[PDB]
Amino acid sequence: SLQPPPQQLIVQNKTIDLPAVYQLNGGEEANPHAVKVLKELLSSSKKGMLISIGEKGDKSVRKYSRQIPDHKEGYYLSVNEKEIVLAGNDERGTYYALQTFAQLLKDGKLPEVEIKDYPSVRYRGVVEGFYGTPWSHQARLSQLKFYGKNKMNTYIYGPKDDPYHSAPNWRLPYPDKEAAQLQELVAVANENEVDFVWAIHPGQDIKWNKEDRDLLLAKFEKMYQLGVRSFAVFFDDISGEGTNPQKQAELLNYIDEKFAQVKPDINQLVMCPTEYNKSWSNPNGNYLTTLGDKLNPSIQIMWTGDRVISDITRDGISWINERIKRPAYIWWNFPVSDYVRDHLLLGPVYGNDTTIAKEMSGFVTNPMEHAESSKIAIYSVASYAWNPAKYDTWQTWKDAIRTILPSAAEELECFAMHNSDLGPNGHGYRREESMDIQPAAERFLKAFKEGKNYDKADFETLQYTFERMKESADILLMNTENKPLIVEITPWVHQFKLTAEMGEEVLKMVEGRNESYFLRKYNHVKALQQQMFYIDQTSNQNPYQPGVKTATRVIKPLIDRTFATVVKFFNQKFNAHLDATTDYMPHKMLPLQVKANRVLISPVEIELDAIYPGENIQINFLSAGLQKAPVKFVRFQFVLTIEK
Numbered sequence: 001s002l003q004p005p006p007q008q009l010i011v012q013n014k015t016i017d018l019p020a021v022y023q024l025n026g027g028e029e030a031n032p033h034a035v036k037v038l039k040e041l042l043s044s045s046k047k048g049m050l051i052s053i054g055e056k057g058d059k060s061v062r063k064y065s066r067q068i069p070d071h072k073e074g075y076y077l078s079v080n081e082k083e084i085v086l087a088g089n090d091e092r093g094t095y096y097a098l099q100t101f102a103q104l105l106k107d108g109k110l111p112e113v114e115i116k117d118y119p120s121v122r123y124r125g126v127v128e129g130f131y132g133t134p135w136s137h138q139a140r141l142s143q144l145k146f147y148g149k150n151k152m153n154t155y156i157y158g159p160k161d162d163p164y165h166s167a168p169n170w171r172l173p174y175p176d177k178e179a180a181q182l183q184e185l186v187a188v189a190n191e192n193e194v195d196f197v198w199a200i201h202p203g204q205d206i207k208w209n210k211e212d213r214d215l216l217l218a219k220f221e222k223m224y225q226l227g228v229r230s231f232a233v234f235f236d237d238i239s240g241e242g243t244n245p246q247k248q249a250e251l252l253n254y255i256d257e258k259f260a261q262v263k264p265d266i267n268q269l270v271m272c273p274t275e276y277n278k279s280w281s282n283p284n285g286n287y288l289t290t291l292g293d294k295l296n297p298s299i300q301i302m303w304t305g306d307r308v309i310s311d312i313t314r315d316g317i318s319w320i321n322e323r324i325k326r327p328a329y330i331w332w333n334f335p336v337s338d339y340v341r342d343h344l345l346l347g348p349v350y351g352n353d354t355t356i357a358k359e360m361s362g363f364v365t366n367p368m369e370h371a372e373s374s375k376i377a378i379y380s381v382a383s384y385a386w387n388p389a390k391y392d393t394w395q396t397w398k399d400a401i402r403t404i405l406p407s408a409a410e411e412l413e414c415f416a417m418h419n420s421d422l423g424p425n426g427h428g429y430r431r432e433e434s435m436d437i438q439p440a441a442e443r444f445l446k447a448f449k450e451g452k453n454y455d456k457a458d459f460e461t462l463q464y465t466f467e468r469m470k471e472s473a474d475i476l477l478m479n480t481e482n483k484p485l486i487v488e489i490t491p492w493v494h495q496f497k498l499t500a501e502m503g504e505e506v507l508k509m510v511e512g513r514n515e516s517y518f519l520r521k522y523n524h525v526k527a528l529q530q531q532m533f534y535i536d537q538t539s540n541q542n543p544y545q546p547g548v549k550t551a552t553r554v555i556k557p558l559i560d561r562t563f564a565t566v567v568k569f570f571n572q573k574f575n576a577h578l579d580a581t582t583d584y585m586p587h588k589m590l591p592l593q594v595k596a597n598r599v600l601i602s603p604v605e606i607e608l609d610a611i612y613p614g615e616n617i618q619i620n621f622l623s624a625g626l627q628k629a630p631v632k633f634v635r636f637q638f639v640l641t642i643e644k
């Protein structure tokens with residue numbers, strides 16, 4: 001597969017060996033970044049096969065000047081028995097030719113091909129713009145290299161929880177250590193043909209005075225000294241005076257006129273509006289029209305679609321584009337998981353109109369705090385933004401996985417296939433999950449509940465799935481090819497294995513040969529539920545959506561409902577009182593929940609499993625601080641906080 005796929009490809013089924021001896025033409029005139037990649041692949045003389053490299057206008061590629069597409073970042077690539085051609089419309093084009101060339105080379109051999117290629121969307125890449133733990137320095141380094149390989153030309157640095165990015169320390173220069181890291185990032189970005197865009201997020205406490213304006217420009221100047229050549233100002237997720245669009249526009253134009261248009265070498269200048277998606281816009285207010293009218297024409301305006309989280313439609317992007325008077329620079333909120341932090345979002349990229357490239361200036365993905373894990377979606381977004389007309393949702397997902405974890409690709413697909421949906425949430429955004437087994441699941445459960453006979457084949461499909469999930473979990477746990485990825489996903493991988501083991505035991509209950517066997521399967525299931533509760537209380541204990549949820553759309557519900565159904569049938573058959581509940585709750589009481597040190601009833605009496613010091617109660621139909629009073633029972637949202 002070539003990823004992204006080129007705009008035009010012509011293949012011939014001859015192949016050539018890569019030349020043992022060869023003549024490199026244009027080595028000194030061409031993009032040094034592209035020559036460096038080429039020299040690595042060759043690891044030469046006057047005699048032997050000709051390799052021509054260079055940009056349109058160089059002597060090296062004069063013969064090919066009409067084949068080179070007249071598009072920024074375009075290139076012409078050709079392989080035949082006599083010569084190899086690697087010719088960009090511009091320097092970035094040449095690097096990209098090389099990235100394509102690297103994907104052709106296979107066991108020291110190349111296909112005979114001719115490619116003319118270029119991107120459909122001008123700016124393509126990643127905004128590190130989420131809430132939560134910002135990416136590590138090493139993660140960022142890995143990322144920038146990954147962007148070069150996938151022709152992503154943009155990295156927008158904007159972690160909401162970097163205090164030198166947002167309030168109040170947006171006014172302070174980075175300390176020495178962080179500055180030296182940022183400097184290395186910029187350098188690595190430059191080597192991979194990525195624009196490091198430094199963003200600032202000053203709007204929550206900005207004063208519309210000289211003092212704050214000069215501090216902002218002084219901060220941009222410090223970043224410039226660090227090598228930064230592109231800049232952004234974000235006015236998202238704020239209130240008060242900073243949402244004034246006249247002021248915002250004047251500030252951006254001042255930055256443009258006094259800094260961007262005054263330096264020798266500034267590239268992108270981007271802003272994120274306060275009204276950044278249609279549901280947050282006031283159609284009857286002047287906010288977006290004031291930006292579209294006043295903002296200088298080279299300044300980009302970001303947009304996340306019809307909602308905070310949405311996929312981009314033709315109608316949606318028309319609506320914004322008419323108000324801002326330019327093509328929106330898309331901020332796509334997937335695979336960002338900062339509002340469903342107990343889920344991993346490892347499914348394919350899909351839902352964005354593939355015919356609307358002309359209507360967008362840019363397309364950037366906001367990723368998860370899990371940097372390695374995000375590469376599935378990043379790789380896919382790179383493919384989509386480069387060649388949206390040829391974008392293949394599923395093949396690109398598979399290619400991403402095989403790229404990221406070639407030693408355990410099938411295992412990663414298995415894990416990812418069942419870790420895709422968000423579950424219920426306030427943004428209303430959902431993804432498909434476990435689609436291959438969903439119909440067998442649905443039939444199995446329909447039959448079973450009614451007291452009709454299930455299909456054998458559907459029982460086997462479910463069994464095979466659980467088996468494969470265990471194989472995948474254990475193999476991924478031990479994988480040393482991408483350790484950082486394995487560290488990110490490990491808690492989820494544990495929870496995923498438990499889920500599968502639970503499924504297997506629940507299926508053994510359905511089969512349920514005798515009373516003694518059934519009861520042993522039942523007790524095993526209860527212990528696996530407890531184990532899943534332990535992971536959910538000890539791993540990933542963030543303040544917002546703590547814990548670890550996996551296979552939530554189809555698999556866990558199947559297991560749970562099946563478990564509840566067989567327990568009921570057993571109780572009817574044997575007049576028993578086996579507990580039918582599916583999540584472990586050590587307290588007693590509408591299931592209770594445990595979140596960090598809170599004990600909630602799900603929206604008269606709760607008994608805790610020990611005595612605790614009580615902190616407060618917050619009922620809602622409204623609170624009461626309990627001064628560390630010892631507490632086991634409570635009687636009358638409905639949340640008890642304790643010390644634990």
Ligand SMILES: NC1=N[C@@H]2[C@@H](O)[C@H](O)[C@@H](CO)O[C@@H]2S1
Nearest residue numbers: 129130131236276336338339
């Ligand atoms: N421009 C936007 N700001 C927020 C981002 O920082 C968040 O990561 C995103 C997802 O919660 O929502 C909105 S989209």
